[PDB]
C-alpha cells in the first residue's frame, strides 16, 4: 500500500444529489475510514441551534423547560461558518457577542374570536393565534448582524413545525440565544436527519439456474434485481444496487445450495439527509475535512514524555 | 417493562453513536438481553416484536387477543409473512453493525417494536452526619444523610472474617 | 402530548407533519401507510413517530382555567 495506489483505485459515484439528501458510493476505501466520515457527519459537524431560552412569561399548558427543549430541536437555516464559537469561561455579559450568538424572540397572546361561525370545531376560527409555529420565531439582529445577515434572515428550515397551542388569555414570551455546537454534545446540533451507509450487494450464483427455477429464484429478490435472460433461459443479476439483502433466497431449500450473498466489500453506499441548514455535500465535505484536521492537529502537537 | 413480566433496571444511558445500528440505519431505543428469556419463557414478547414491526410498516393495528391463533395458524408464520411482504427478514432478524468497531455483527440480530412501560419509583449516601442525642449513633433519615448500619448479620460476617479493626 | 418536533432516531423534522397527516386520513381517505409515505416518512424510525402519536394535548386543552365555561 501507498497513498498513490489508493488515489488510482479510489472512486466516487453520485447516484442522486439534492438540496436535502445525497446518495453516493465510495468505492475501494477501507471500512475504518468510511466509518470515520459517518461518525463525524453525525456528531462533529457544527450547527446552529437554540441553546439558552429566556422566558418572561408562559401561561400555556406546556411547561417552560419542555417548550425550551422543542425550540432547541428546531433546525435553524443558518450557515455555521457565519458564526464563531462561544468561550464558556467568560461571564454572561462577555460570553455573548455578534459573532457568537443569534437571538430569536417569540411573542404570542391568545384571544377569543367574536366572529366565529357558530358551532365551529376549528381552533383557527374559534381562537386567534391558538397555534404557535416555528416560523413565529422572529429573528432579532444584534450589532453588525443587521448588515451580515441582511441577505439571509434567520428562518427555521421547517416553518410549519408545531411548537405550542394556546387558549384565550394565555401568552408566551421568550428570547432564545442560538450558538454553535456539535451532535456529540447534544443531538439538537447534529446536522443530519441521518447519515448512514450500507455495503453494496453482491449476489453471485454458484451454477446456472433456469426454467421454472429461474422464475422462482427471481422472486426471492425485489423487482429488477434478478433478470431472466432470453436464450440461455438462465437467471443472472441485473443490478444488485436495488437489492435490500432480505436473505429471502436462503429460506427456500432448493436455492440455499446455489447462491452466496456477499458485498463488494469496502464499497460503501452512503445516504446523507440534511436537517436543513447545509446541503448534504457540504456536510460530507466538512466531515472529510474534520478528519484531516484531527490528523494534522495531532502531527503538530509535541509529545510530552 | 414490556407487557410480559420482563422487568428491567436501567443500567446505562448508552450513547447512540455507541449503540448497534441496523441495515435500516436505526438505533434501538431499548436493549433487552437474550439471556433474560430462556428461564422465563415469555414467548409472547417475541411475537409482539414481529407483530409490532409489521404493524409500524403496514400502518396496521395488530390484534393480540388470547386464543385467536392455534397450532395450524401460528403468529410467527402470520406476522413473519407480513414482514416478508414488507421487505424485511421473515424471522424478524435484521443485520446490524457494531457502533464501536463499525463492522457487521456475527449474525442477524432480533429487532422489532415492543410496547414498554416505565415503572414508578431512591439511593442514599452519607459521609458522616447527624447523631441521636442519647446514643450518639447515626440518626435514621436518608432525607437527612442517613447512615446505613453495620448489622449483626454484618457482625457475624466480620467475625467470620475476623476483621477486628473494621468491627472496632 | 403534542407532536414531537424531531423523530427520536432519525433527527428528521416531523412536527410539521401532524395536521396534514390527519387531513390525509380524513379528507383524502387514504390508509395510514400511504399517507405516511406521501409526507416523506421513509425510514420506519420516522413512520413510527406520526403513525403512533397521541394528540393528548387536545384533551388537556379542554380544561382552561382562564375562561367562563
Amino acid at each position: 500500500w501507498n497513498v498513490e495506489k489508493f488515489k488510482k483505485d479510489f472512486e466516487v459515484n453520485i447516484s442522486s444529489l439534492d438540496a436535502r439528501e445525497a446518495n453516493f458510493d465510495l468505492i475501494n476505501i477501507d471500512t475504518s475510514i468510511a466509518n470515520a466520515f459517518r461518525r463525524i457527519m453525525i456528531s462533529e459537524v457544527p450547527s446552529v441551534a437554540a441553546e439558552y431560552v429566556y422566558f418572561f412569561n408562559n401561561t400555556s399548558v406546556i411547561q417552560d423547560e419542555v417548550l425550551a427543549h422543542r425550540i432547541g430541536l428546531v433546525p435553524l437555516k443558518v450557515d455555521p461558518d457565519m458564526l464563531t464559537w462561544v468561550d464558556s469561561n467568560l461571564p454572561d455579559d462577555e460570553k455573548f457577542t455578534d459573532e457568537n450568538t443569534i437571538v430569536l424572540s417569540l411573542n404570542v397572546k391568545c384571544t377569543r374570536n367574536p366572529d366565529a361561525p357558530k358551532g365551529s370545531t376549528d381552533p383557527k376560527e374559534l381562537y386567534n393565534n391558538a397555534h404557535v409555529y416555528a416560523r413565529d420565531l422572529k429573528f432579532e439582529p444584534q450589532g453588525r448582524q443587521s448588515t451580515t445577515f441582511a441577505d439571509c434572515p434567520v428562518v427555521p428550515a421547517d416553518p410549519d413545525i408545531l411548537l405550542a397551542k394556546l387558549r384565550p388569555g394565555q401568552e408566551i414570551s421568550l428570547k432564545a440565544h442560538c450558538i454553535l455546537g456539535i451532535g456529540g454534545d447534544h443531538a439538537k446540533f447534529s446536522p443530519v436527519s441521518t447519515a448512514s451507509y450500507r455495503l453494496l450487494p453482491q449476489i453471485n450464483i454458484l451454477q446456472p439456474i433456469k426454467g421454472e427455477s429461474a422464475r422462482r429464484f427471481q422472486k426471492c429478490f425485489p423487482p429488477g434485481v434478478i433478470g431472466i435472460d432470453e436464450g440461455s433461459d438462465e437467471a443472472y443479476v441485473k443490478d444488485a444496487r436495488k437489492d435490500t439483502v432480505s436473505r429471502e433466497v436462503l429460506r427456500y431449500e432448493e436455492f440455499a445450495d446455489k447462491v452466496k450473498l456477499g458485498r463488494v466489500r469496502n464499497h460503501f453506499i452512503f445516504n446523507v439527509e440534511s436537517a436543513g441548514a447545509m446541503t448534504p455535500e457540504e456536510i460530507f465535505f466538512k466531515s472529510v475535512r474534520i478528519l484531516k484536521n484531527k490528523a494534522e492537529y495531532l502531527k503538530n502537537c509535541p509529545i510530552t514524555q | 417493562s414490556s407487557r410480559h413480566g420482563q422487568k428491567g433496571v436501567c443500567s446505562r444511558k448508552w450513547p447512540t453513536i455507541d449503540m448497534p445500528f441496523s441495515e435500516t440505519g436505526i438505533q434501538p431505543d431499548i436493549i433487552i438481553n437474550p439471556h433474560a428469556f430462556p428461564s422465563r419463557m415469555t414467548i409472547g414478547m417475541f411475537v409482539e416484536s414481529l407483530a409490532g414491526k409489521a404493524g409500524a410498516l403496514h400502518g396496521i393495528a395488530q390484534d393480540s387477543t388470547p386464543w385467536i391463533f392455534n397450532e395450524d395458524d401460528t403468529p410467527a408464520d402470520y406476522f413473519g409473512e407480513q414482514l416478508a411482504k414488507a421487505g424485511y427478514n421473515y424471522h424478524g432478524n435484521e443485520p446490524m453493525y457494531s457502533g464501536a468497531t463499525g463492522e457487521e455483527l456475527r449474525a442477524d440480530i432480533y429487532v422489532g417494536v415492543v410496547y414498554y412501560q416505565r415503572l414508578r419509583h431512591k439511593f442514599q449516601v452519607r459521609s458522616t452526619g447527624p447523631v441521636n442525642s442519647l446514643t450518639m449513633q447515626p440518626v435514621k433519615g436518608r432525607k437527612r444523610h442517613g447512615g446505613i448500619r453495620v448489622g449483626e448479620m454484618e457482625r457475624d460476617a466480620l467475625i467470620g472474617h475476623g476483621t477486628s479493626f473494621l468491627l472496632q | 402530548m403534542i407532536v414531537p418536533v424531531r423523530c427520536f432516531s432519525c433527527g428528521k423534522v416531523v412536527g410539521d407533519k401532524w395536521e396534514s397527516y390527519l387531513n390525509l386520513l380524513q379528507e383524502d381517505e387514504l390508509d395510514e401507510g400511504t399517507a405516511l409515505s406521501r409526507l416523506g416518512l421513509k425510514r420506519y424510525c420516522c413512520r413510527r413517530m406520526i403513525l403512533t402519536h397521541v394528540d393528548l394535548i387536545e384533551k388537556f386543552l379542554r380544561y382552561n382555567p382562564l375562561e367562563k365555561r
Binding site: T244 | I68, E81 | -
Partner: peptide, 24 residues
C-alpha cells in the same frame, strides 16, 4: 374453530435504502 383470518393483499412495504416500490 375458525383460524384468525389472514389479511388479504399484503405486499412488500420495505426496500433497501436507495430503492422503492416500483423498482420491483
Amino acid at each position: 374453530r375458525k383460524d384468525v383470518p389472514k389479511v388479504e393483499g399484503l405486499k412488500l412495504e420495505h426496500f433497501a435504502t436507495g430503492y422503492d416500490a416500483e423498482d420491483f
